[PDB]
Design a protein around this ligand. Structure first.
Ligand SMILES: CCCCCCCCCCCCCCCCCC(=O)O
Length: 133
């Protein structure tokens, strides 16, 4: 079940985000500001429809999806992708596909913290979120 993921979460640690963003071709100036941004992520559910909000002073996104059903997405860096999110080994696994490329955004609860692992190419970023509410 998804239920321990639900709520409001704040970024408290980030490792290799610049490498991940550079791998996606994000420009230097956007990486600069993103490296100093601390987002809030809000995860809500209504039945098997999940809504994932990511808020900040820089960029803001919102997606809604049905678990295990593909959806179109336009990412914070303006990639137009085909996406699917599923529970897999108790993790929320978000797979984005575009132009034959793939990136995964994997969320796992470890000791009450939500660990977001971002993989594109060889770049692996780990971001740790702490529960606000
Ligand atoms: C909405 C805020 C996202 C994080 C700061 C802006 C970064 C914009 C350029 C890179 C976007 C890459 C895809 C989205 C990464 C999501 C990271 C996260 O939720 O912590």
């Amino acid at each position: 079940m998804v239920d321990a993921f639900l709520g409001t979460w704040k970024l408290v640690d980030s490792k290799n985000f610049d490498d991940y963003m550079k791998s996606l071709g994000v420009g230097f100036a956007t990486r600069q500001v993103a490296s100093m941004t601390k987002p809030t992520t809000i995860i809500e559910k209504n039945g098997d429809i999940l809504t994932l909000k990511t808020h900040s002073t820089f960029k803001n996104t919102e997606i809604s999806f049905k678990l295990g059903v593909e959806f179109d997405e336009t990412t914070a860096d303006d990639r137009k992708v085909k996406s699917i999110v599923t529970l897999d080994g108790g993790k929320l696994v978000h797979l984005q596909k575009w132009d034959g490329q793939e990136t995964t955004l994997v969320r796992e609860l470890i000791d009450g913290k939500l660990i977001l692992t971002l993989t594109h190419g060889t770049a692996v970023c780990t971001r740790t979120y702490e529960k606000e509410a």
